[PDB]
Write a protein that binds this ligand. Structure first.
Ligand SMILES: CC(=O)O[C@H]1C(=O)[C@@]2(C)[C@H]([C@H](OC(=O)c3ccccc3)[C@]3(O)C[C@H](OC(=O)[C@H](O)[C@@H](NC(=O)c4ccccc4)c4ccccc4)C(C)=C1C3(C)C)[C@]1(OC(C)=O)CO[C@@H]1C[C@@H]2O
Ligand SMILES: CC(=O)O[C@H]1C(=O)[C@@]2(C)[C@H]([C@H](OC(=O)c3ccccc3)[C@]3(O)C[C@H](OC(=O)[C@H](O)[C@@H](NC(=O)c4ccccc4)c4ccccc4)C(C)=C1C3(C)C)[C@]1(OC(C)=O)CO[C@@H]1C[C@@H]2O
Ligand SMILES: Nc1nc2c(ncn2[C@@H]2O[C@H](COP(=O)(O)OP(=O)(O)OP(=O)(O)O)[C@@H](O)[C@H]2O)c(=O)[nH]1
Ligand SMILES: Nc1nc2c(ncn2[C@@H]2O[C@H](COP(=O)(O)OP(=O)(O)OP(=O)(O)O)[C@@H](O)[C@H]2O)c(=O)[nH]1
Ligand SMILES: Nc1nc2c(ncn2[C@@H]2O[C@H](COP(=O)(O)OP(=O)(O)O)[C@@H](O)[C@H]2O)c(=O)[nH]1
Ligand SMILES: Nc1nc2c(ncn2[C@@H]2O[C@H](COP(=O)(O)OP(=O)(O)O)[C@@H](O)[C@H]2O)c(=O)[nH]1
Ligand SMILES: [Mg+2]
Ligand SMILES: [Mg+2]
Lengths: 430, 426, 430, 426
């Protein structure tokens, strides 16, 4: 009942996983060895063996051994089933075609089988939670090989997808635009709700709200994990207005292809700041409509809102929430589309946000995660297809992709399909 | 798990190699005896990248040593780490290359290469999953230039899909010890442009400039030059030997570094580099580590990058550091220096970050630049070559080995084709 | 009441015996000196003398001294009666005709005298358990000499036979095809249920399920003994649905000559994984239908099932078993014959599987042994009679067999009789 | 319990024999005095296979020592282990064989064989169950070739069903010490093809090739050659002396190794063999033992197996090892080398595995090849014989012993019949 299989692909997905599973163990009170000292609240994420050991409903996949061998050696080595951690022989080299066509074939039929040996333990599997990098070779190419299989083997089941997406200026690779554009078929055809996130936006959120001058990835992953906990909290706990994983989508997604919401969390705040402000429902609701808190570097004021899911958790009351979203409807800078007169889906859940004890983020009685479908996100696509255009006009790295079994025409067919999505998000704003 | 096979050719290749084996054995915590004596499980969890296990927990380097004289084998084997290598991996002739490429490629190394190749076969098939070949040599003289490129050709034909990665010490006008260096280098670069996946171009003039104007060494030896080379050799494979925030295999470098197939002639560098009398006064922090790393004085080929544009740079950082600070600095560099990067690539810098800095350093960066300025290294060699060849000087020593004059015409033709392809994007 | 005489022949049968008697001693709580510290559960396998010493109902026979002199010297030297460990002077040399006509001709009337002195201590002897190699000279030739005698001396009594059979690729001898084909008269005429087992199939089970990279024969014999403990468990213990040794045959054997079932065991599992798998009755039932767990290298999907005996042991309930076999009947890849609409014989026994303390195979609440008559096994015969045909077309080793008193025509008469069995298993699938 | 009777003939047979008795006495832990001094019960459990028990728990080896000269008896009796043998079992003449087969077979040894054979009876009647005869000799010269094959004929007629198993050092052109070597061997091979159940063909050219190209010995003696032979003699009987996962008697070898009655001319080998200065760098394990064992440089006859196909190979392993790993490697060899095995046999490799490896190594493998490449050993002797015999050279030394010219014609006829039967299955 209410299970979610969680798939963590390549270094970014595995390292966000290593923060998600750090959080879910604390929030359910599971030890890092998988035991539980002293109710079904853990069941969405944890299978229970007869011995009294909890086991996570997850798969970690990397085509190179290094990051998953860290998990198999660090403090979580006792938690996972030693076959649900899957390592290939050779790296995908930031090349989509190694992930999808050449190295992915040597491990996909093992990955998909271990996913099936998790599904046979569920009773009403609610959906999939797929975590990856858009810029990676495994991140783009292996996720796109895996989603194509999952979308024929589990066609009804909703596939939610958490993507670290290329930034305006911050980048780690030269070929990040190629891998991202080649991924756009995956998200359009074989995904049901795709949460784009940006490293440069979280780096700025960390600088302004957390007072941390120079963050690592472990800081970012303790913000991305906090969103997925807050999405799943209605699946795991009691609330005044619990939201199902399918109910969420019926309010977020206005049209079949328009399933790329922004996400944001409030209050992101340092423990030193959190004493000197009161953090009421109205304050944390207004914080979600600041450009300063969006986790993709695009401005929501250059768009129109189609729908917002305000998923509150902790000590919040429907009085306060209605009184808050009445002020958001009053502000003329926050503009909805003419065809969504309701605008807001509200969720309210009684479980406060857990604090990771080694984290930068305050204890707070309340949080909200706002997940928001808006026309503005098309600018994050207009940035990256302008990076693609400069390189494909030269064929600047194309021999590495053609050399590993890809058709050269797939680059044109992917830039074409992205232009049809960037068209669709401009078309519905009117 | 991503094994490497490492090969040393001639005096220079065996000297930069036998210094590298002292460096990566200090990283992995291996005694000269071959016994493990390190601190950390992270030193041992990837020892299979460069070594084989043997009985009694002795570790044997996966190195093959090649020469046409016994005297460099005697110099490596009698050296500080000389006991660590497998006695049966020393493969040698008994009369020298005479500083002649054609002796290396056609006569004295053409005899020997079959007894190299069956040792390379023994070590490569004994690997679990080979990633590539790491060959150290020089382009001057005859053993490294002519036998090493024969050996690249033979290994390339047998392992077509594995990374061929070469570290190539090569001629420059103001620091030279051979009359026939331009001939040997021109005949050798003709093989590297076709066969290798990466070649790291290294210069004794630039390695003396680091020693004099950065380290302030009063009398730098070849042992001090070999230490600068081997730091960048330890640097580029770090991400398959240790954990990190961003992992980059040698192939993950190649896909990002080499836009068009033949433009793979790189120029390495290292940070920090200080005099031992100024390390007390400097911060090793990522901004200072970056301002050094992009300095025209820090790079190990005499080509000033300000005489061209970078296609790609890779900065492989090591140590506990912020990804914001690393991503900030690799942005600030290519925006404030935008006239020195090609403007048809939207980001010219690859980054990687390992969690384990070199022993005794809090941070390090190894730099790889694919600058068009490297056209100057191939140009000046081609201009030295042209002057000797226009009057056929010294060619009876090469044509005596049965080489054609047509092969000199064709090698320098292919050299100018390499110069033209770098100049095209400039 | 309910005795079994276990006869262990040649090196393979004796070394499987040294694992069988290692297990039975642990399972009944008998010390390796035959004493029992502190119900008649042991009575099937052990005679009890007035000193309080339990002596096994076993005969060990080898034509050479080496393997039984090791049994006479190791930890079990005090278990066995010294004259039921029987040895000759001369090895059978992997030659059937030395085992049957020349060397075994001398030891046979001493082997029978021990079997008579064991049967005269039984009261309602249930049957014989005969352990051997098909590829051996003693294994084929001496077992076929002995069975011909036991089938006139004890004609009514059920003869169950456990055979290590030649593999697709793994082999230890050049003449293994000759000895195996010459044995096919023994199993057809003088046996009642013959369990073929393969070294290469267990080597692959060891690699995939125990995760032991490089197993010995001690690892194989510890799986082969575990199946016979599970066949005999209903003879030895209390259960919900105990199965008699002839009740077993009345459900396994559809036709007089169609008595070559496959065997498999589940869960084969290591201590690395047994604490993370559920090992529910549904999973360990489904594991028996995987090609991955069959102990002969043939694919059951290239056959049809005639009958299955699912012999469960440990903590299981008839609810769970019926609910499990209902899913097996639902799966279209597991195909029964049109003439067996019932298909399944179920046994359920309350005694868990005993761990050998030195072993790789983990402690588990449940096991099933599935013994299964299927048309697929004819491919393991089609492999080996194609090895025979290449050598007999040259008469490639025939002078060693003709030189030791065999008729040359017996090779043709054995290849002929095997083709009539391989015909019978193809004929009944229709 | 499967006793063996061992017989030594001529200088070579007594020298490979007197070294063999030092090797198996080290294994069984027997002192040069004949007293037991070993570690283990397993050493004593089968000591009857090669020794007789005598008073005071002294062990006396079941050798018969045969020569036509006293000087090799004097050299054995005075040697490292000479005092071990029974004084009555030294059976000898005074005037030698003159390197003449016909002196061995018709004159000097025909006198002596009545005094040999009646000692072979005293040892065979002391046996509980004799399995066979293990005869060491050479096919060059006159004592081993001509008296040893007389003695094979006499023991074969008296014991027709016991294993006759011979270790036969035999001629080759590049390592030769006798003018009439081709004659003596051709007259002797004519007896071996009819009477023996197994003959292990050994060559001094191949035993010197192991000493130079594997062991890297600078000056290999006959004592070093005798050590290589006697390692494979200890090897093939191991499975009746020690326990194992797969036991193979000499008869269990013969049934698997000899497809057609006369094709029993085997070719032995041994592993691991390592250069003395290199052992610490080598991993002792089943796939390295395999890659040595199945390579053309390791076999103890001059035949390169790449000039034929194997009929059967037996690999008798010793040590604590996996049956999956043994069965995997003996599969991988004959599938990856399938052009070198006959394709009318569906598996060409017999395996055996003993639990007790030789003293001082963790594992070992004795290799026995049967291959159509053994045609080359019989061919080159037959063509050296032919080139002398067309001009009747040296025949007065043989016809002086009353031998016919017809016996030379009939021996070389039977030699070409043995060459033709191996070449038939090529
Ligand atoms: C107290 C202190 O700070 O000591 C430093 C030091 O003073 C400086 C000057 C060191 C020092 O370097 C040199 O003296 C040198 C001389 C000629 C050529 C190259 C180097 C040092 O010797 C070098 C040494 O580096 C290492 O030990 C690294 O692990 C290095 N391996 C070796 O140098 C090595 C030496 C002997 C045997 C085996 C290895 C390494 C480099 C790259 C990748 C892996 C390992 C270090 C930190 C120092 C001293 C000791 C003074 C410097 O080198 C490095 C690589 O850090 C030169 O400029 C840097 C900055 C350092 O501050
Ligand atoms: C520390 C160490 O590794 O010692 C080894 C050794 O260095 C090497 C080189 C040994 C050594 O072998 C020789 O030197 C040699 C020289 C000429 C001809 C044959 C051998 C060794 O002497 C030989 C000796 O082997 C034995 O003792 C065997 O049990 C052997 N018996 C004898 O050699 C022997 C010697 C004196 C008296 C009686 C017996 C044997 C072989 C087959 C069957 C039964 C017994 C061993 C392990 C070693 C040394 C001591 C260096 C090697 O031999 C063996 C049989 O292992 C040669 O290649 C192997 C690999 C070994 O590593
Ligand atoms: N927030 C965050 N971003 C990460 C993390 N790890 C990697 N990234 C991002 O991942 C993007 C590139 O993808 P890769 O890390 O190379 O993805 P990959 O799947 O491992 O790629 P391959 O090595 O080719 O298989 C970069 O833009 C990084 O900023 C992490 O732990 N947290
Ligand atoms: N699983 C397993 N298989 C074994 C064992 N011992 C031998 N075998 C198998 O036995 C088969 C060959 O039969 P032999 O071992 O030679 O049988 P044998 O009766 O002793 O034959 P003879 O020596 O001629 O009397 C091979 O295919 C081996 O794999 C053992 O302990 N376990
Ligand atoms: N860095 C470095 N350069 C060397 C070394 N030895 C020689 N060189 C230089 O680089 C060139 C190498 O050529 P060499 O290796 O002698 O030719 P080879 O032996 O025929 O391959 C020489 O002319 C020297 O200038 C050394 O130990 N280190
Ligand atoms: N391996 C080995 N070969 C020997 C030895 N002594 C001689 N040989 C060689 O093999 C041949 C043996 O012939 P030999 O035994 O002298 O003839 P015989 O005494 O008449 O039987 C000689 O020609 C030598 O080449 C020895 O100790 N060991
Ligand atoms: Mg990756
Ligand atoms: Mg046997």
């Amino acid at each position: 009942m209410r299970e979610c299989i969680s798939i963590h692909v390549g270094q970014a997905g595995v390292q966000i996983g290593n923060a998600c599973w750090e959080l879910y163990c604390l929030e359910h009170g599971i030890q890092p060895d998988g035991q539980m000292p002293s109710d079904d609240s853990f069941n969405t994420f944890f299978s229970e063996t007869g011995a009294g050991k909890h086991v996570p409903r997850a798969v970690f996949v990397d085509l190179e051994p290094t990051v998953i061998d860290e998990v198999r050696t660090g403090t979580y080595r006792q938690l996972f089933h030693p076959e649900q951690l899957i390592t290939g022989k050779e790296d995908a080299a930031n090349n989509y075609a190694r992930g999808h066509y050449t190295i992915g074939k040597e491990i996909i039929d093992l990955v998909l089988d271990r996913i099936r040996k998790l599904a046979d333990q569920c009773t009403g599997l609610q959906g999939f939670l797929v975590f990856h990098s858009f810029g990676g070779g495994t991140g783009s190419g292996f996720t796109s090989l895996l989603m194509e299989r999952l979308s024929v083997d589990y066609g009804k089941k909703s596939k939610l997808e958490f993507s670290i997406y290329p930034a305006p200026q911050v980048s780690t690779a030269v070929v990040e635009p190629y891998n991202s554009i080649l991924t756009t078929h995956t998200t359009l055809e074989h995904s049901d709700c795709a949460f784009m996130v940006d490293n440069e936006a979280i780096y700025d959120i960390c600088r302004r709200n957390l007072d941390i001058e120079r963050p690592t990835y472990t800081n970012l992953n303790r913000l991305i994990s906090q969103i997925v906990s807050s999405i799943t909290a209605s699946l795991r706990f009691d609330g005044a207005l619990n939201v199902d994983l399918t109910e969420f989508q019926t309010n977020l997604v206005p049209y079949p292809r328009i399933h790329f919401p922004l996400a944001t969390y409030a209050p992101v705040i340092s423990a030193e700041k959190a004493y000197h402000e009161q953090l009421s429902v109205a304050e944390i609701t207004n914080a979600c409509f600041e450009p300063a808190n969006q986790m993709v570097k695009c401005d929501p004021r250059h768009g129109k809102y189609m729908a917002c899911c305000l998923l509150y958790r902790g000590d919040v009351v429907p009085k306060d929430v209605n009184a808050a979203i009445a002020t958001i409807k009053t502000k003329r800078s926050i503009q909805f589309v003419d065809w969504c007169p309701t605008g807001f889906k509200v969720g309210i859940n009684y479980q406060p946000p857990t604090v990771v004890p080694g984290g930068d983020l305050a204890k707070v009685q309340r949080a909200v995660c706002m997940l928001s479908n808006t026309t503005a996100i098309a600018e994050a696509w207009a940035r990256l297809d302008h990076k693609f255009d400069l390189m494909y006009a030269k064929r600047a790295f194309v021999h590495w992709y053609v050399g590993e079994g890809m058709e050269e025409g797939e680059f044109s067919e992917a830039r074409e399909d992205m232009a049809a999505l960037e068209k669709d998000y401009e078309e519905v704003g009117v | 798990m991503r094994e490497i096979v490492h090969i040393q050719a001639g005096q220079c290749g065996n000297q930069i190699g036998a210094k590298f084996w002292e460096v990566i054995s200090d990283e992995h915590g291996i005694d000269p005896t071959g016994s493990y004596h390190g601190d950390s499980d992270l030193q041992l969890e990837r020892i299979n990248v460069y070594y084989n296990e043997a009985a009694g927990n002795k570790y044997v380097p996966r190195a093959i040593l090649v020469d046409l004289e016994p005297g460099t084998m005697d110099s490596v084997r009698s050296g500080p780490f000389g006991q660590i290598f497998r006695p049966d991996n020393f493969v040698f002739g008994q009369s020298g290359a005479g500083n002649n490429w054609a002796k290396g490629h056609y006569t004295e190394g053409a005899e020997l290469v079959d007894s190299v190749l069956d040792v390379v076969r023994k070590e490569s098939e004994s690997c679990d999953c080979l990633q590539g070949f790491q060959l150290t040599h020089s382009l001057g003289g005859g053993t490294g230039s002519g036998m090493g490129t024969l050996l690249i050709s033979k290994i390339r034909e047998e392992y077509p899909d594995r990374i061929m990665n070469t570290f190539s010490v090569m001629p420059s006008p103001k620091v030279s010890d051979t009359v026939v260096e331009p001939y040997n280098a021109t005949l050798s670069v003709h093989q590297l442009v076709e066969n290798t996946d990466e070649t790291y171009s290294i210069d004794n003039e630039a390695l003396y400039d680091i020693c004099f104007r950065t380290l302030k060494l009063t009398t730098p030896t070849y042992g001090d030059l070999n230490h600068l080379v081997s730091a960048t050799m330890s640097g580029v494979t770090t991400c398959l030997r240790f954990p990190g925030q961003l992992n980059a295999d040698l192939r993950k470098l190649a896909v990002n570094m080499v836009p068009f197939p033949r433009l793979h002639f790189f120029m390495p560098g290292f940070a920090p580099l200080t005099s031992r009398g100024s390390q007390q006064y400097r911060a090793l922090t990522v901004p200072e580590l970056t301002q050094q790393m992009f300095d025209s004085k820090n790079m190990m080929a005499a080509c000033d990058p300000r005489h061209g544009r970078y296609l790609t740079v890779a900065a492989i950082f090591r140590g506990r550091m912020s990804m914001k600070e690393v991503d900030e600095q690799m942005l600030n560099v290519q925006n404030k220096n935008s006239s020195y990067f090609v403007e048809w690539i939207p980001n010219n810098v690859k980054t990687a970050v390992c969690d384990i800095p070199p022993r005794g350093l809090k941070m390090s960066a190894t730099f790889i630049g694919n600058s068009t300025a490297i056209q100057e290294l191939f140009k000046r060699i081609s201009e030295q070559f042209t002057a000797m060849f226009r009057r056929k000087a010294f060619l009876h020593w090469y044509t005596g080995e049965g080489m054609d004059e047509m092969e000199f015409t064709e090698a320098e033709s292919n050299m100018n084709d390499l110069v033209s392809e770098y100049q095209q994007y400039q």
